[PDB]
Ligand binder design. Structure first.
Ligand SMILES: *[C@@H]1O[C@H](CO)[C@@H](O[C@@H]2O[C@H](CO)[C@@H](O)[C@H](O)[C@H]2NC(C)=O)[C@H](O)[C@H]1NC(C)=O
Length: 110
């Protein structure tokens, strides 16, 4: 699924919180479908399956809150494409297209 693939690329990372570097990834064409050096993005430190599970009971395009918490790195406030980095554990709010996550809405419950 195209939308799912884009979501995984843009928001899911197999990197650890410590090894993750916003300055690197926010400017890495391999993980920036909507373009590099964007103002803000949140990365989910997890295997893809648990994230897809968030949409297991969703029908149509609808926002869903995850029932489990994930480790999240948010890259923001760039200055010449160099970012401030923050990490938190929280639930996430995403838009599902049936069983596929397609858009990251916000950190925490919807
Ligand atoms: C990504 O770039 C930012 C901005 O250069 C780094 O944060 C700065 O780090 C220096 C030390 O190297 C500090 O003196 C500045 O005060 C920091 N600025 C901000 C806005 O925090 C950030 O550490 C870099 N990311 C990584 C993983 O090294």
């Amino acid at each position: 699924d195209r939308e799912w693939e884009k979501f995984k690329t843009k928001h899911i990372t197999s990197q650890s919180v410590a090894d993750f570097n916003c300055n690197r990834t926010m400017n890495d064409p391999a993980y920036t479908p909507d373009g590099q050096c964007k103002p803000i993005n949140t990365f989910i430190h997890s295997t893809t399956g648990p994230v897809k599970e968030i949409c297991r009971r969703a029908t149509g395009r609808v926002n869903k809150s995850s029932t489990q918490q994930f480790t999240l790195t948010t890259c923001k406030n760039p200055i010449r494409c160099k970012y401030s980095q923050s990490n938190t554990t929280n639930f996430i709010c995403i838009t599902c297209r049936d069983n596929y996550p397609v858009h990251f809405v916000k950190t925490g419950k919807c």
